[PDB]
Amino acid sequence: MMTFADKVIQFNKDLSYTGSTLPPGIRIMNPFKEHEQTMHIVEAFYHKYYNDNQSRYLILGINPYRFGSGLTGIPFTDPKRLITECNIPYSGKLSHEPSSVFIYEMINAFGGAEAFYKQFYISSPCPLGFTSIAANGKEKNYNYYDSKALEKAVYEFIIENIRKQLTLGITTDTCFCLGTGKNEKFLMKVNAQYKFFKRIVALEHPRFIMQYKTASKQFYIDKYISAFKALNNS
């Protein structure tokens, strides 16, 4: 349990859903129990970028989805970005995640994966995802906040996960929240209750940027980087 990487690896290895019964039709989606390749990628990634005992600033997404980074276990890192940006091999079907494209263009504008991950650690309030399958067979992914019943079912599980992420060695002055909608409302209410962080800075979620601000992706790159700079300036 020595390094930051060791702790993340043990966390993901041990992660299991301990919340309440989910709404009808919804199944827990645990990327680390789905396919045997995932933990190997986890080990490869964190030992590459977190092989130290330095603290990190926390960036919080929403929660994993089955596609893209859900096949790697690495936040915002789909198979193509894992191969091309992290130089870590991936066997099997590629899975395109728009958020991963944005995040790694931002990371390169920042100075590269090594420099960024030396300073930042990405997680999410809810470390698991959720899926349902419709009568036609199409599969739906959920955000933890998509209904009052789902959020109620997973609330303490989420709080315990955030507390657990803080035990990794997190500089708590600023947490960055990706998602200016319901994710922000949830994390502001949580932080007012528990005071995990001195302040929360919310940024548009990479998926929102890719889908609705596509022509302006560069501006949002700058926005992310100016927020990280303001933290380091001050």
PDB file of C-alpha atoms in Angstrom:
ATOM      1  CA  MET A   1       0.000   0.000   0.000  1.00  0.00           C
ATOM      2  CA  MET A   2       3.126   2.102  -0.227  1.00  0.00           C
ATOM      3  CA  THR A   3       2.781   4.390  -3.261  1.00  0.00           C
ATOM      4  CA  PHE A   4      -0.176   6.410  -4.511  1.00  0.00           C
ATOM      5  CA  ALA A   5      -0.417   3.901  -7.370  1.00  0.00           C
ATOM      6  CA  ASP A   6      -0.408   0.964  -4.937  1.00  0.00           C
ATOM      7  CA  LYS A   7      -3.331   2.494  -3.042  1.00  0.00           C
ATOM      8  CA  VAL A   8      -5.377   3.186  -6.181  1.00  0.00           C
ATOM      9  CA  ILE A   9      -4.722  -0.368  -7.409  1.00  0.00           C
ATOM     10  CA  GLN A  10      -5.837  -1.887  -4.100  1.00  0.00           C
ATOM     11  CA  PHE A  11      -8.915   0.367  -4.096  1.00  0.00           C
ATOM     12  CA  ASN A  12     -10.004  -0.724  -7.552  1.00  0.00           C
ATOM     13  CA  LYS A  13      -9.240  -4.370  -6.756  1.00  0.00           C
ATOM     14  CA  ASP A  14     -11.393  -4.255  -3.606  1.00  0.00           C
ATOM     15  CA  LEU A  15     -14.204  -2.076  -4.979  1.00  0.00           C
ATOM     16  CA  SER A  16     -17.676  -3.606  -4.652  1.00  0.00           C
ATOM     17  CA  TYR A  17     -21.150  -2.098  -4.474  1.00  0.00           C
ATOM     18  CA  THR A  18     -22.292  -1.677  -0.855  1.00  0.00           C
ATOM     19  CA  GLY A  19     -25.271   0.634  -1.421  1.00  0.00           C
ATOM     20  CA  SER A  20     -28.993  -0.046  -1.334  1.00  0.00           C
ATOM     21  CA  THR A  21     -31.156  -2.016  -3.767  1.00  0.00           C
ATOM     22  CA  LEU A  22     -31.193  -0.281  -7.145  1.00  0.00           C
ATOM     23  CA  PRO A  23     -34.331   0.745  -9.070  1.00  0.00           C
ATOM     24  CA  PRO A  24     -35.954  -1.815 -11.389  1.00  0.00           C
ATOM     25  CA  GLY A  25     -33.957  -2.721 -14.480  1.00  0.00           C
ATOM     26  CA  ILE A  26     -30.645  -1.219 -13.299  1.00  0.00           C
ATOM     27  CA  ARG A  27     -27.489  -3.319 -12.880  1.00  0.00           C
ATOM     28  CA  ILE A  28     -24.252  -2.241 -11.230  1.00  0.00           C
ATOM     29  CA  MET A  29     -21.427  -1.824 -13.760  1.00  0.00           C
ATOM     30  CA  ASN A  30     -18.014  -2.442 -12.184  1.00  0.00           C
ATOM     31  CA  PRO A  31     -15.310  -2.042 -14.882  1.00  0.00           C
ATOM     32  CA  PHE A  32     -12.790  -3.881 -12.721  1.00  0.00           C
ATOM     33  CA  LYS A  33     -14.930  -7.030 -12.447  1.00  0.00           C
ATOM     34  CA  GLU A  34     -16.219  -6.975 -16.046  1.00  0.00           C
ATOM     35  CA  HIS A  35     -13.100  -8.157 -17.899  1.00  0.00           C
ATOM     36  CA  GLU A  36      -9.790  -9.595 -16.692  1.00  0.00           C
ATOM     37  CA  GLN A  37      -7.754  -7.180 -18.832  1.00  0.00           C
ATOM     38  CA  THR A  38      -8.987  -4.139 -16.890  1.00  0.00           C
ATOM     39  CA  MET A  39      -6.906  -4.582 -13.736  1.00  0.00           C
ATOM     40  CA  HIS A  40      -3.835  -5.298 -15.818  1.00  0.00           C
ATOM     41  CA  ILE A  41      -4.356  -1.950 -17.476  1.00  0.00           C
ATOM     42  CA  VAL A  42      -5.007  -0.389 -14.091  1.00  0.00           C
ATOM     43  CA  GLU A  43      -1.697  -1.757 -12.815  1.00  0.00           C
ATOM     44  CA  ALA A  44       0.137  -0.619 -15.918  1.00  0.00           C
ATOM     45  CA  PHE A  45      -1.332   2.884 -15.900  1.00  0.00           C
ATOM     46  CA  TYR A  46      -0.952   3.898 -12.259  1.00  0.00           C
ATOM     47  CA  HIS A  47       2.506   2.357 -11.910  1.00  0.00           C
ATOM     48  CA  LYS A  48       3.473   4.475 -14.879  1.00  0.00           C
ATOM     49  CA  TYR A  49       2.098   7.813 -13.722  1.00  0.00           C
ATOM     50  CA  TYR A  50       1.574   7.618  -9.951  1.00  0.00           C
ATOM     51  CA  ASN A  51       4.727   5.736  -8.893  1.00  0.00           C
ATOM     52  CA  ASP A  52       5.517   8.102  -6.025  1.00  0.00           C
ATOM     53  CA  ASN A  53       4.172   9.432  -2.718  1.00  0.00           C
ATOM     54  CA  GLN A  54       3.438  12.984  -3.846  1.00  0.00           C
ATOM     55  CA  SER A  55       0.009  14.419  -3.159  1.00  0.00           C
ATOM     56  CA  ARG A  56      -2.467  15.125  -5.966  1.00  0.00           C
ATOM     57  CA  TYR A  57      -5.312  17.517  -6.652  1.00  0.00           C
ATOM     58  CA  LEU A  58      -8.618  15.729  -7.204  1.00  0.00           C
ATOM     59  CA  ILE A  59     -10.655  15.988 -10.402  1.00  0.00           C
ATOM     60  CA  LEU A  60     -14.114  14.404 -10.178  1.00  0.00           C
ATOM     61  CA  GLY A  61     -16.165  13.179 -13.102  1.00  0.00           C
ATOM     62  CA  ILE A  62     -19.641  11.739 -12.752  1.00  0.00           C
ATOM     63  CA  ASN A  63     -19.321   7.953 -12.852  1.00  0.00           C
ATOM     64  CA  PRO A  64     -18.050   5.260 -15.258  1.00  0.00           C
ATOM     65  CA  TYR A  65     -19.949   4.104 -18.320  1.00  0.00           C
ATOM     66  CA  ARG A  66     -19.712   0.725 -19.988  1.00  0.00           C
ATOM     67  CA  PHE A  67     -18.048   2.033 -23.144  1.00  0.00           C
ATOM     68  CA  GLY A  68     -14.731   3.733 -23.746  1.00  0.00           C
ATOM     69  CA  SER A  69     -12.836   4.150 -20.491  1.00  0.00           C
ATOM     70  CA  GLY A  70     -15.146   1.546 -18.934  1.00  0.00           C
ATOM     71  CA  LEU A  71     -13.184  -0.985 -20.988  1.00  0.00           C
ATOM     72  CA  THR A  72      -9.824   0.258 -19.659  1.00  0.00           C
ATOM     73  CA  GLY A  73     -10.701   1.127 -16.065  1.00  0.00           C
ATOM     74  CA  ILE A  74      -8.796   4.411 -16.497  1.00  0.00           C
ATOM     75  CA  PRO A  75     -10.876   7.619 -16.204  1.00  0.00           C
ATOM     76  CA  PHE A  76     -11.439   9.431 -19.523  1.00  0.00           C
ATOM     77  CA  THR A  77      -8.998   7.039 -21.246  1.00  0.00           C
ATOM     78  CA  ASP A  78     -10.604   4.931 -23.972  1.00  0.00           C
ATOM     79  CA  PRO A  79      -8.645   2.141 -25.718  1.00  0.00           C
ATOM     80  CA  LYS A  80      -7.338   4.372 -28.517  1.00  0.00           C
ATOM     81  CA  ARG A  81      -6.094   7.009 -26.078  1.00  0.00           C
ATOM     82  CA  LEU A  82      -4.586   4.286 -23.885  1.00  0.00           C
ATOM     83  CA  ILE A  83      -2.611   2.983 -26.865  1.00  0.00           C
ATOM     84  CA  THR A  84      -1.634   6.255 -28.536  1.00  0.00           C
ATOM     85  CA  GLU A  85      -1.313   8.659 -25.584  1.00  0.00           C
ATOM     86  CA  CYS A  86      -0.237   6.396 -22.696  1.00  0.00           C
ATOM     87  CA  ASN A  87       1.675   3.858 -24.857  1.00  0.00           C
ATOM     88  CA  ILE A  88       0.013   1.001 -22.953  1.00  0.00           C
ATOM     89  CA  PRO A  89      -1.203  -1.923 -25.099  1.00  0.00           C
ATOM     90  CA  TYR A  90      -4.868  -2.879 -25.403  1.00  0.00           C
ATOM     91  CA  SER A  91      -6.319  -6.114 -26.795  1.00  0.00           C
ATOM     92  CA  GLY A  92      -9.841  -6.187 -28.193  1.00  0.00           C
ATOM     93  CA  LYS A  93     -12.503  -3.942 -29.657  1.00  0.00           C
ATOM     94  CA  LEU A  94     -11.845  -0.233 -29.756  1.00  0.00           C
ATOM     95  CA  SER A  95     -14.503   1.965 -28.166  1.00  0.00           C
ATOM     96  CA  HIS A  96     -14.719   5.654 -28.994  1.00  0.00           C
ATOM     97  CA  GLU A  97     -15.209   8.036 -26.064  1.00  0.00           C
ATOM     98  CA  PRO A  98     -15.523  11.723 -27.086  1.00  0.00           C
ATOM     99  CA  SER A  99     -14.634  12.814 -23.554  1.00  0.00           C
ATOM    100  CA  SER A 100     -11.318  10.980 -23.916  1.00  0.00           C
ATOM    101  CA  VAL A 101     -10.474  12.901 -27.088  1.00  0.00           C
ATOM    102  CA  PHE A 102     -11.115  16.204 -25.331  1.00  0.00           C
ATOM    103  CA  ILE A 103      -9.268  15.212 -22.156  1.00  0.00           C
ATOM    104  CA  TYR A 104      -6.118  14.113 -23.943  1.00  0.00           C
ATOM    105  CA  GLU A 105      -6.029  17.150 -26.239  1.00  0.00           C
ATOM    106  CA  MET A 106      -6.261  19.201 -23.038  1.00  0.00           C
ATOM    107  CA  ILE A 107      -3.557  17.106 -21.373  1.00  0.00           C
ATOM    108  CA  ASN A 108      -1.173  17.604 -24.302  1.00  0.00           C
ATOM    109  CA  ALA A 109      -1.890  21.338 -24.274  1.00  0.00           C
ATOM    110  CA  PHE A 110      -1.050  21.178 -20.545  1.00  0.00           C
ATOM    111  CA  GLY A 111       2.347  19.567 -21.134  1.00  0.00           C
ATOM    112  CA  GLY A 112       1.735  15.855 -21.544  1.00  0.00           C
ATOM    113  CA  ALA A 113       0.361  12.904 -19.602  1.00  0.00           C
ATOM    114  CA  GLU A 114       3.384  12.568 -17.297  1.00  0.00           C
ATOM    115  CA  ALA A 115       3.327  16.202 -16.172  1.00  0.00           C
ATOM    116  CA  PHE A 116      -0.457  16.333 -15.770  1.00  0.00           C
ATOM    117  CA  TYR A 117      -0.801  13.045 -13.871  1.00  0.00           C
ATOM    118  CA  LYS A 118       2.156  14.027 -11.670  1.00  0.00           C
ATOM    119  CA  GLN A 119      -0.158  16.816 -10.405  1.00  0.00           C
ATOM    120  CA  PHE A 120      -3.732  15.565 -10.864  1.00  0.00           C
ATOM    121  CA  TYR A 121      -5.718  12.424 -10.107  1.00  0.00           C
ATOM    122  CA  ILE A 122      -9.071  11.810 -11.776  1.00  0.00           C
ATOM    123  CA  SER A 123     -11.887   9.910 -10.046  1.00  0.00           C
ATOM    124  CA  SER A 124     -15.678  10.276  -9.709  1.00  0.00           C
ATOM    125  CA  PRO A 125     -18.083  10.538  -6.743  1.00  0.00           C
ATOM    126  CA  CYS A 126     -19.658   7.222  -7.675  1.00  0.00           C
ATOM    127  CA  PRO A 127     -16.902   4.769  -8.683  1.00  0.00           C
ATOM    128  CA  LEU A 128     -19.324   2.355 -10.388  1.00  0.00           C
ATOM    129  CA  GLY A 129     -21.653   2.695 -13.343  1.00  0.00           C
ATOM    130  CA  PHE A 130     -25.183   1.555 -14.071  1.00  0.00           C
ATOM    131  CA  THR A 131     -26.804  -0.050 -17.099  1.00  0.00           C
ATOM    132  CA  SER A 132     -30.244  -1.128 -18.231  1.00  0.00           C
ATOM    133  CA  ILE A 133     -31.366  -2.983 -21.328  1.00  0.00           C
ATOM    134  CA  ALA A 134     -34.523  -1.954 -23.183  1.00  0.00           C
ATOM    135  CA  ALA A 135     -37.075  -4.316 -24.695  1.00  0.00           C
ATOM    136  CA  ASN A 136     -35.336  -3.858 -28.133  1.00  0.00           C
ATOM    137  CA  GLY A 137     -31.952  -4.758 -26.605  1.00  0.00           C
ATOM    138  CA  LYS A 138     -30.304  -1.305 -26.690  1.00  0.00           C
ATOM    139  CA  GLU A 139     -28.266  -0.648 -23.560  1.00  0.00           C
ATOM    140  CA  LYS A 140     -28.559   2.550 -21.529  1.00  0.00           C
ATOM    141  CA  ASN A 141     -25.956   3.983 -19.197  1.00  0.00           C
ATOM    142  CA  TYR A 142     -26.964   6.083 -16.214  1.00  0.00           C
ATOM    143  CA  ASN A 143     -25.490   8.913 -14.216  1.00  0.00           C
ATOM    144  CA  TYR A 144     -25.882   8.450 -10.470  1.00  0.00           C
ATOM    145  CA  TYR A 145     -28.163  11.518 -10.364  1.00  0.00           C
ATOM    146  CA  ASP A 146     -30.520  10.475 -13.170  1.00  0.00           C
ATOM    147  CA  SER A 147     -33.354   9.836 -10.693  1.00  0.00           C
ATOM    148  CA  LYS A 148     -34.096  10.520  -7.035  1.00  0.00           C
ATOM    149  CA  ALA A 149     -34.422   6.779  -6.378  1.00  0.00           C
ATOM    150  CA  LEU A 150     -31.029   5.908  -7.888  1.00  0.00           C
ATOM    151  CA  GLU A 151     -29.272   8.766  -6.076  1.00  0.00           C
ATOM    152  CA  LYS A 152     -30.981   7.801  -2.818  1.00  0.00           C
ATOM    153  CA  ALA A 153     -29.875   4.196  -3.293  1.00  0.00           C
ATOM    154  CA  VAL A 154     -26.206   5.105  -3.834  1.00  0.00           C
ATOM    155  CA  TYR A 155     -25.818   8.205  -1.603  1.00  0.00           C
ATOM    156  CA  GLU A 156     -23.813   6.768   1.333  1.00  0.00           C
ATOM    157  CA  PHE A 157     -21.814   4.572  -1.039  1.00  0.00           C
ATOM    158  CA  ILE A 158     -20.812   7.783  -2.831  1.00  0.00           C
ATOM    159  CA  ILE A 159     -19.878   9.647   0.371  1.00  0.00           C
ATOM    160  CA  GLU A 160     -17.774   6.713   1.573  1.00  0.00           C
ATOM    161  CA  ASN A 161     -16.060   6.558  -1.819  1.00  0.00           C
ATOM    162  CA  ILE A 162     -15.157  10.264  -1.698  1.00  0.00           C
ATOM    163  CA  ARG A 163     -13.776   9.868   1.828  1.00  0.00           C
ATOM    164  CA  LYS A 164     -11.767   6.871   0.576  1.00  0.00           C
ATOM    165  CA  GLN A 165     -10.376   8.849  -2.353  1.00  0.00           C
ATOM    166  CA  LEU A 166      -9.250  11.525   0.105  1.00  0.00           C
ATOM    167  CA  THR A 167      -7.180   8.956   1.995  1.00  0.00           C
ATOM    168  CA  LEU A 168      -4.903   8.632  -1.072  1.00  0.00           C
ATOM    169  CA  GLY A 169      -3.049  11.866  -0.293  1.00  0.00           C
ATOM    170  CA  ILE A 170      -5.128  14.668  -1.785  1.00  0.00           C
ATOM    171  CA  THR A 171      -4.493  18.409  -1.564  1.00  0.00           C
ATOM    172  CA  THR A 172      -7.959  19.531  -0.499  1.00  0.00           C
ATOM    173  CA  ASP A 173      -7.736  23.272  -1.255  1.00  0.00           C
ATOM    174  CA  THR A 174      -9.567  22.818  -4.570  1.00  0.00           C
ATOM    175  CA  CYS A 175     -11.523  19.921  -6.029  1.00  0.00           C
ATOM    176  CA  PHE A 176     -12.374  20.244  -9.715  1.00  0.00           C
ATOM    177  CA  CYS A 177     -15.912  19.198 -10.680  1.00  0.00           C
ATOM    178  CA  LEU A 178     -16.583  18.170 -14.298  1.00  0.00           C
ATOM    179  CA  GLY A 179     -20.251  18.776 -15.072  1.00  0.00           C
ATOM    180  CA  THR A 180     -21.846  22.153 -14.413  1.00  0.00           C
ATOM    181  CA  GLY A 181     -25.276  20.632 -14.115  1.00  0.00           C
ATOM    182  CA  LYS A 182     -26.444  18.021 -11.654  1.00  0.00           C
ATOM    183  CA  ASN A 183     -22.915  16.890 -10.753  1.00  0.00           C
ATOM    184  CA  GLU A 184     -22.141  20.402  -9.529  1.00  0.00           C
ATOM    185  CA  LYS A 185     -25.366  20.660  -7.517  1.00  0.00           C
ATOM    186  CA  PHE A 186     -24.646  17.314  -5.851  1.00  0.00           C
ATOM    187  CA  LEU A 187     -21.000  18.073  -5.070  1.00  0.00           C
ATOM    188  CA  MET A 188     -21.808  21.526  -3.694  1.00  0.00           C
ATOM    189  CA  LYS A 189     -24.424  20.048  -1.368  1.00  0.00           C
ATOM    190  CA  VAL A 190     -21.998  17.268  -0.337  1.00  0.00           C
ATOM    191  CA  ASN A 191     -19.172  19.739   0.296  1.00  0.00           C
ATOM    192  CA  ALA A 192     -21.425  22.010   2.327  1.00  0.00           C
ATOM    193  CA  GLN A 193     -22.354  19.011   4.461  1.00  0.00           C
ATOM    194  CA  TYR A 194     -18.916  17.461   4.968  1.00  0.00           C
ATOM    195  CA  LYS A 195     -16.406  20.228   4.029  1.00  0.00           C
ATOM    196  CA  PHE A 196     -14.133  17.845   2.160  1.00  0.00           C
ATOM    197  CA  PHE A 197     -12.666  20.727   0.187  1.00  0.00           C
ATOM    198  CA  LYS A 198     -11.950  24.384   0.799  1.00  0.00           C
ATOM    199  CA  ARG A 199     -13.530  25.189  -2.580  1.00  0.00           C
ATOM    200  CA  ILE A 200     -14.946  23.448  -5.652  1.00  0.00           C
ATOM    201  CA  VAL A 201     -14.269  24.705  -9.185  1.00  0.00           C
ATOM    202  CA  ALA A 202     -16.783  23.421 -11.734  1.00  0.00           C
ATOM    203  CA  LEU A 203     -15.889  22.966 -15.407  1.00  0.00           C
ATOM    204  CA  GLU A 204     -18.071  21.893 -18.322  1.00  0.00           C
ATOM    205  CA  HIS A 205     -17.996  18.130 -18.655  1.00  0.00           C
ATOM    206  CA  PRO A 206     -15.852  16.860 -21.572  1.00  0.00           C
ATOM    207  CA  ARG A 207     -18.874  15.040 -23.016  1.00  0.00           C
ATOM    208  CA  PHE A 208     -20.913  18.254 -23.023  1.00  0.00           C
ATOM    209  CA  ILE A 209     -18.014  20.089 -24.682  1.00  0.00           C
ATOM    210  CA  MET A 210     -17.595  17.455 -27.401  1.00  0.00           C
ATOM    211  CA  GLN A 211     -21.319  17.218 -28.118  1.00  0.00           C
ATOM    212  CA  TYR A 212     -22.517  20.835 -27.856  1.00  0.00           C
ATOM    213  CA  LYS A 213     -19.441  23.081 -27.883  1.00  0.00           C
ATOM    214  CA  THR A 214     -17.511  21.138 -30.486  1.00  0.00           C
ATOM    215  CA  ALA A 215     -16.498  24.115 -32.618  1.00  0.00           C
ATOM    216  CA  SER A 216     -15.263  25.766 -29.391  1.00  0.00           C
ATOM    217  CA  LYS A 217     -13.307  22.826 -27.925  1.00  0.00           C
ATOM    218  CA  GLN A 218     -10.098  24.885 -27.944  1.00  0.00           C
ATOM    219  CA  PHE A 219     -11.660  27.555 -25.726  1.00  0.00           C
ATOM    220  CA  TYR A 220     -12.606  24.894 -23.204  1.00  0.00           C
ATOM    221  CA  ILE A 221      -9.090  23.505 -23.342  1.00  0.00           C
ATOM    222  CA  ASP A 222      -7.914  26.973 -22.401  1.00  0.00           C
ATOM    223  CA  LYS A 223     -10.573  27.195 -19.716  1.00  0.00           C
ATOM    224  CA  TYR A 224      -9.407  23.971 -18.102  1.00  0.00           C
ATOM    225  CA  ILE A 225      -5.794  25.002 -18.266  1.00  0.00           C
ATOM    226  CA  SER A 226      -6.486  28.462 -16.908  1.00  0.00           C
ATOM    227  CA  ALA A 227      -8.250  26.897 -13.917  1.00  0.00           C
ATOM    228  CA  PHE A 228      -5.297  24.613 -13.207  1.00  0.00           C
ATOM    229  CA  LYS A 229      -2.932  27.578 -13.651  1.00  0.00           C
ATOM    230  CA  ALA A 230      -4.904  29.757 -11.225  1.00  0.00           C
ATOM    231  CA  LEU A 231      -4.517  27.009  -8.625  1.00  0.00           C
ATOM    232  CA  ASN A 232      -0.731  26.833  -9.167  1.00  0.00           C
ATOM    233  CA  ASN A 233      -0.327  30.597  -9.484  1.00  0.00           C
ATOM    234  CA  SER A 234      -1.986  31.095  -6.094  1.00  0.00           C
TER     235      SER A 234
END
